[PDB]
């Protein structure tokens, strides 16, 4: 609660307004993201799923893990391919989902616990930039971070995250990391600006979160969804653009802020990767990439790495 107060105050009073994307993921937002994963324009989920379908047995063989830790786990739908391979290999003992959204952990924990009789479920609620120490150091761990969620951190915080995560890995542990790759810029923008309007609803939902949690009065349909490709930084950006001037009261903060007509507020970055740079970022964090896989079109990459 304090985290949200501080993030919203800092974000809305900055000259370039912004909100952190972790706050998209309340119950409504997590469900909207689940819908995003099945949009025709949003290739990341099905392409990473393709790689996992092909490579899960190999990944499990390489890792030899009895414990799957998943960061930003969400519904853990793709994760079931890894869990199935761990069960086939007679290795699976434990699943540790980690997420900021307590609801999605309760749902996924319940489902996975039932689908895999005899495995321990130990859900951890937290922010993966601050609370990795809540994850138990137990067993032989395959730590999984799918979806290119690592791209939702800009380069300095990403490097700090990776180094911190690397320092939690013991010998015998492995990191499986999904990274979305640089590609045609039209395909990229459309993946964040679908015909169905679902991404736009997901984006505007951060305003609903602030409205509810902090007693604010954002008018959601006064804000236009804008997805941009930033070619200098090689990242997708999501923005909310005020269609007309807006006066917003955030009552829990005793705060009033103004949006000019046309004023844009940054709600998310999604950094896109060049394959050879993924090796370098891992190495910088003290991790040796041991395997690299891509889908048949080269849209998406999956790394396995160790200390």
Ligand X SMILES: Nc1ncnc2c1ncn2[C@@H]1O[C@H](CSCC[C@H](N)C(=O)O)[C@@H](O)[C@H]1O
Piece in contact with Mg ion (CB under 5 A), picked from 29-37, 111-119, 171-179, 216-224 = 216-224
Give ∠ CA 1-152-132 in degrees, rounded to 5. 60
Q: Is 267 in the site for ligand AVI (CB under 6 A)?
A: no
42 is in an annotated binding site: yes
99 is in an annotated binding site: yes
Q: How far is the CB of 129 from ligand X (least distance, A)?
A: 6
Q: How far is the CB of 245 from ligand X (least distance, A)?
A: 31
Chain residue whose CB lies nearest Mg ion: 219
DSSP state of 267: E
Q: How many CA atoms lie within 13 A of 31 on its CB side?
A: 5
Q: Is 84 in the site for Mg ion (CB under 5 A)?
A: no
93 touches 67 (CB < 8 A): yes
Tokens coding 78: 């793709």
The H or E element that residue 305 is part of is strand 300-306
Q: How far apart are CA 242 and CA 219, in angstroms?
A: 10
Q: How far apart are CA 182 and CA 124, in angstroms?
A: 32
**Which of positions 218-257 make contact with Mg ion (CB under 5 A)?**
219, 221-222
98 touches 71 (CB < 8 A): yes
Q: Is 225 in the site for Cl ion (CB under 5 A)?
A: yes
Q: Is 204 in the site for Cl ion (CB under 5 A)?
A: no
Q: Which residues are annotated as a binding site for L-histidine?
A: 42, 152, 192, 268-270
Task: Give contact residues for ligand AVI (rule: CB under 6 A).
Answer: 36, 44, 147-149, 151-152, 192, 199, 202, 238, 268, 270
- Which residues are known binding-site members for S-adenosyl-L-methionine? 72, 78, 99, 127-128
Contact residues for Mg ion (CB under 5 A)? Answer: 219, 221-222
């Amino acid at each position: 609660a304090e985290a949200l107060r501080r993030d919203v105050r800092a974000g809305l009073t900055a000259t370039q307004k912004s909100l952190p994307p972790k706050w998209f993921y309340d119950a409504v937002g997590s469900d909207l993201f689940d819908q995003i994963t099945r949009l025709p324009e949003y290739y990341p989920t099905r392409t990473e799923a393709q790689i996992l379908r092909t490579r899960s047995a190999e990944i499990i063989s390489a890792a030899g893990a009895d414990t799957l830790v998943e960061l930003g786990s969400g519904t853990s739908e793709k994760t079931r391919m890894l869990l199935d391979a761990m069960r086939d290999a007679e290795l699976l003992r434990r699943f540790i989902p980690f997420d900021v959204d307590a609801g999605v952990l309760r749902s996924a924990g319940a489902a996975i616990g039932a689908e895999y009789p005899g495995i321990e479920i130990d859900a951890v609620c937290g922010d993966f930039e601050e609370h990795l120490g809540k994850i138990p150091h137990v067993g032989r761990r395959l730590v999984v971070f799918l979806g290119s969620t690592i791209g939702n951190l800009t380069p300095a915080p990403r490097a700090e995250f990776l180094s911190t995560l690397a320092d939690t890995l013991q010998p015998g542990d492995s990191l499986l990391l999904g990274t979305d790759l640089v590609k045609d810029t039209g395909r990229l923008v459309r993946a964040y600006d679908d015909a169905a309007g679902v991404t736009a609803a997901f984006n505007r939902n951060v305003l609903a979160v602030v409205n509810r949690e902090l007693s604010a009065d954002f008018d959601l349909d006064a804000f236009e969804h804008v997805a941009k490709w930033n070619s200098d930084e090689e990242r997708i950006e999501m923005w909310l653009r005020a269609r007309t001037a807006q006066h917003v009261r955030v009552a829990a903060l005793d705060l009033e802020v103004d949006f000019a007509a046309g004023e844009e507020m940054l709600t998310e970055v999604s950094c896109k990767f060049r394959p050879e740079n993924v090796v370098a970022e891992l190495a910088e964090a003290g991790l040796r990439q041991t395997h690299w896989w891509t889908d048949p079109a080269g849209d998406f990459g999956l790394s396995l790495a160790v200390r």
